[PDB]
Structures are given as structure tokens and as C-alpha cells.
């Protein structure tokens, strides 16, 4: 399994994200979304993360 260490979901709080993990480029802080949020985010904005981010596969 892909276990993301380090990284929790910021749509659903999942910690650590296992599976593909969603890592915002706009975003300082840092925004990550798991695979289910990405696949639908969410309140999921706020803050410094826009809907205008966008967010790339986490190699
Ligand atoms: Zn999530
Ligand atoms: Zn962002």
C-alpha cells in the first residue's frame, strides 16, 4: 500500500492518506487531498486554497 507519511487529507482529515495522494502546486502551508476527495474536494476550500489551485498526483 501507498502510505503517505506525513500527509493528511484536507477535505476529510485522513491521516496518513494511503493510495494516491493529491498535493496542491498553488499552495506555504500545503493542501493535499486523498484520492476519494479529489475524485468528487469538498467546505474542502477555504483559507489559502482556492478552487482556482490546482493540485498534481504526490510521485
Ligand atoms: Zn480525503
Ligand atoms: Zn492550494
Given at each position: 500500500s501507498n502510505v503517505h507519511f506525513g500527509a493528511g487529507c484536507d477535505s476529510c482529515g485522513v491521516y496518513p492518506i494511503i493510495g494516491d495522494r493529491y498535493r496542491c502546486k498553488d499552495c506555504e502551508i500545503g493542501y493535499d487531498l486523498?484520492?476519494?476527495?479529489?475524485?468528487?474536494?469538498?467546505?474542502?476550500?477555504?483559507?489559502?486554497?482556492?478552487?482556482?489551485?490546482?493540485?498534481?498526483l504526490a510521485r
Open positions: 486523498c484520492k476519494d476527495c479529489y475524485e468528487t474536494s469538498k467546505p474542502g476550500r477555504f483559507q489559502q486554497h482556492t478552487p482556482d489551485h490546482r493540485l498534481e
